Amino acid sequence: KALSAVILAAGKGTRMYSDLPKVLHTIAGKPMVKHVIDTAHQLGSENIHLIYGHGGDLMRTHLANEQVNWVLQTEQLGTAHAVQQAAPFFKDNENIVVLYGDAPLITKETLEKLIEAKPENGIALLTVNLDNPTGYGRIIRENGNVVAIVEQKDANAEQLNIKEVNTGVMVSDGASFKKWLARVGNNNAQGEYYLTDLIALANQDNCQVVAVQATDVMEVEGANNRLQLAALERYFQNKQASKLLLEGVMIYDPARFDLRGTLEHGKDVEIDVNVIIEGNVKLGDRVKIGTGCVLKNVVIGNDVEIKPYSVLEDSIVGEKAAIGPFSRLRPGAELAAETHVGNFVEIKKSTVGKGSKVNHLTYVGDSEIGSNCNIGAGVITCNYDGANKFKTIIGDDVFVGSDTQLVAPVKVANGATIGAGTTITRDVGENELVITRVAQRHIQGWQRPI
Amino acid sequence: KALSAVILAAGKGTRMYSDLPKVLHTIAGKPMVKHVIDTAHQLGSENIHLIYGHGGDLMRTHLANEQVNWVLQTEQLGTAHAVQQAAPFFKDNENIVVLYGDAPLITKETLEKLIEAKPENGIALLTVNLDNPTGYGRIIRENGNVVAIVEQKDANAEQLNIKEVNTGVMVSDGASFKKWLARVGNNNAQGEYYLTDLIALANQDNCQVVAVQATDVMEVEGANNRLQLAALERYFQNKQASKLLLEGVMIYDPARFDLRGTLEHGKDVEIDVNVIIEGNVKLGDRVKIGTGCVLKNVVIGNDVEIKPYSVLEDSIVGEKAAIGPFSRLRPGAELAAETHVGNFVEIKKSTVGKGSKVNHLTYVGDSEIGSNCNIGAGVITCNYDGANKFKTIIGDDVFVGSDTQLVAPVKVANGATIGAGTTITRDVGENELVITRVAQRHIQGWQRPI
Amino acid sequence: KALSAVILAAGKGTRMYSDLPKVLHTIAGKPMVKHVIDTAHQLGSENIHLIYGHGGDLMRTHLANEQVNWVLQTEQLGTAHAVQQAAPFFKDNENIVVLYGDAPLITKETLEKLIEAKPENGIALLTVNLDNPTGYGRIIRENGNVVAIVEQKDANAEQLNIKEVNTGVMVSDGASFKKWLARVGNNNAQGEYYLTDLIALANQDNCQVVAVQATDVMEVEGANNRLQLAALERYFQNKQASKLLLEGVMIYDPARFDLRGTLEHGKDVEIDVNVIIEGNVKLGDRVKIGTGCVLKNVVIGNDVEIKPYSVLEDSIVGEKAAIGPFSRLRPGAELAAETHVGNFVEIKKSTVGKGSKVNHLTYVGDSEIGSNCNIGAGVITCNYDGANKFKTIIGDDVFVGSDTQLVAPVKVANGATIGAGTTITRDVGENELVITRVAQRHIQGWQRPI
Ligand SMILES: O=c1ccn([C@@H]2O[C@H](CO)[C@@H](O)[C@H]2O)c(=O)[nH]1
């Protein structure tokens, strides 16, 4: 049958000591709540009811394009109250899964088991075994069913030894939720309407609740502060790295690798220590990434080596190119096959054609460079003082001598040769040689401070 | 009552294989002994007696400004002998705490408990529970008192199972120390005067010794070699990072963060992987530090982003500034609000005014730059060959074209415009445009090696 | 008696998802099989029989200079079959040790114990204690001898509890191997000729097999995929770092240090976080390496500081030199004593004499620079457009003003002085001052876009 999700995300997150609400803090570059939404979506959720409250404005700006039902909870009177805000929108005969916006590691596969285990008119409850279950409600199994969740202060001696514990994530049909939520009270030390009480209410109705253990403890872990969040981050990165290693990516040290987005890869890819991969990155076969590199939204072709301490964003690199070390590709950098970009070089919004080299101490911006060009050390594309940023066009087989300033807008045609120390403001023709006539004063017998 | 400390720091540290004495090796950028001195000071110690010996000269040069009594122990005849060197300076009715210069992680809070537990005319002894106590003297409790410390080779079968062990750190009043130290002998396998024997001597006098367990084992851990020192370092950094995370600083990976000094911070600070913070650093609200950055003695204002692989020392950065990646601020760099410093830029002992940008391949040294200036790619401030390093003064709203050499001393007044490829040796006036007249030779039909 | 080794290395390594065969994947920059070969050599092996098959061509190109007997196994019919391929070459009265090309951490010291324990006409079998031995053949000791290796599916209840397990590495004399290998059958679920069966065959002959436990479990661990390989890598680096720390090298964080080759060092060497050492590196006394540095095949003299994010390859650095941060030494860089190389500087195949400084934004290639020179910011050595790369010769006590282009081939004699913004194409004489005569246009009252 159909499925929808409710995600509890209204919390202030006081112990984060932040201007943001609890669930907006990122794991691997994405808000915690976004992880949970995505997981709900790939589960097949038809609707996703997002219970929000604190930092409402920020939730709306940060998650503006999310396909969720925005359910504003004006006061946090308990998890049952929270879910009840969305209950009018539950279809009677759809399953509903309740998830928490501050528990981002929960997997599709665990939630599929949970949903599959749910008996008709009953509940499937996700539990977890802890080594120290102190403080948490103990699962009481009679036969293969949960008959009680006994809190810390009520448990007798033997019940205290139970390691199976309640996570609060559960599945039931919409009609059952509507019925039981109306029966939850707040007669307890905290004065709150707890979703937990649905288990007792289900048992009152002679309805079955079945326990499903989560395989991994960290899966169901929340973060109330940034220390806990950093542990979740590390668990997430390790799991991402392990998957990549098992797919055949050589990662020299998985504890020193960060993926913040998606990585598509070929075979025999080698990624050295302290690399960060951000947004959507695609690497071909035999790509080697040296230590310290940062790649954000890039496509790298087969057989490319990126040497250490290179930073690339919104860029495309063709096969057999060589980049680095200390290279910078800024958005719109498009390097063709067999290009060479070297140390202390910055390329911005420019195309560089096949075989061309830009190997030292150079800025190329808003430019088109053709094939088999030689851009010397110290070359700079610049503009006049004024308005917009105009274009430099360099054709094929051009030599640009070291320390040349190319003053846009200007065009240098095929086969041209420009001498070192030149300032180019006028168009250079095909097969034109331009050299600077220097005037020098030579003084003999100049003794330096000895 | 009053308190003073004795710190044992005379050891050669042979297994460090170093020219330095044992306690001078650093943890988080500070000599191990300096950690212990600081802790003794914040404990409220009136005097701090530093027992030193090996590497005496180096101890004096490295710790010249420390407020300690320099007690030179000519021969290491045992820990009791060491403490006895300082005993003439103990006040009869002050408490004395004995600490070790090679155990830098001991905390104020543990030492406060220890001092509080000390019975009148008695001793408080710091103990620790080990899982493998082999080799260490076992604490023998009869009632709530220590009656013996039984060494490895003397313990019977059941005493060998005791996990509580002697650390050697202890508190007693000055008069008691003077009395008992005179009674310590060296009749043992090593021929040494052990401070340990004070427990036996106290019991002989019908004086009470009380055990106080250290909460954390690493707290009381010493370092005899650099492997052990690296473990202490890692424990220290983890503890520093955890504190920061609990105060609301987002540290992407606490195992890849180093603090070597003090960090003051606002809210919503984000610190990426592999950052090093040195000396005194102050970060405002919403500061983002990218991967690989090194900040030593800097003040960073609100809303500043430092992009990856930037190195900053002795510098000030105003609010909303943007630095990096690959930027270098050397001592005396002062960047105003809303400034921009980009890749492969070095700024030394210079002020840069509000809104100004220095975005590529540039060296600015000994300069004053005003507000809303545009310093082009390839610009260099330089001096004549000779003596001292003179100043370049650039006013407000100045455009400096790419690859300009500014030859100090020189002044460029408000609103001036300098063309690319220029050498400025003479003062430029207000609203003066200076462009270089190039002479070029153009040769048509120059065929390059095809 | 004499010794030879057999190394099993024929495997395809399907789960690496690579074009390379299993054993060619690197640990610390060297193929796994190369580790095992080296270990066999330092053990004193007279012959090393390398059983190879899959990726044969790549094995030959990658290991072309290895002193091994190339034994091509056309089909992998089991470990006994593999060893039998080399058996015709075993000397009757030499010991033979069988090792695996995908288990690179096995040590000389463990293998020496194994060989020493081998009884005459018997076998010494390397075993290991696992906490979860499920799936592995259990060692059955009767007295001090192995009488059976009982596989998982045959073991009774009590045998399943045995933690001692078979590794497959073993030593026996050549004659015994020849005899027993001919008697191994393939009557089993997998249809393979297992080397394991030698233990049963030895017992049939009333020959003694003795177990020798490996001290470290990781020692005998293989890698079937890149996840397992990364764990081996991390174990290896940690062990290398621990050895260095115990020799007196200060490594700020051993988990963030990589050695890929050999390191020779003096005393009081300090290596900050995230350093990579490759090939053969030699560091003198008091060398400090800052964070992020990469050193490949370099010699560094006493008292050199390399500041953060410097990359050095095939270079020599004299005593008291200062490099970095953000410096690049490319192959053939030779820096004399007391030199200074600064940020965004690239030096390639050049000698730089004593006391000389090259501190910013500079490329020096194919050059000789003498002593006490001052190479200004923005200086570039370049060539004419044409063929080979010619040499720039700068003598002693030369000042080269900022942004000078030195156009090879050219010579600048002792004591010469070159002004900023100069293009040098002609030889400069001793004590010659060369300054550029600029022509500038000055326009007063030029109002910039306000
Ligand atoms: O009324 C509530 C109660 C709890 N929760 C969320 O559910 C999680 C578990 O209590 C917490 O993160 C909390 O913010 C809310 O969204 N609304």
Ligand SMILES: O=c1ccn([C@@H]2O[C@H](CO)[C@@H](O)[C@H]2O)c(=O)[nH]1
């Ligand atoms: O006579 C001594 C004996 C020991 N200690 C120090 O006390 C510590 C514990 O023995 C060691 O680090 C040692 O250097 C000294 O300063 N003087």
Ligand SMILES: O=c1ccn([C@@H]2O[C@H](CO)[C@@H](O)[C@H]2O)c(=O)[nH]1
């Ligand atoms: O016939 C064989 C059987 C196994 N092995 C190698 O021995 C190791 C243990 O089976 C594996 O890595 C496998 O590749 C081979 O070289 N030849």
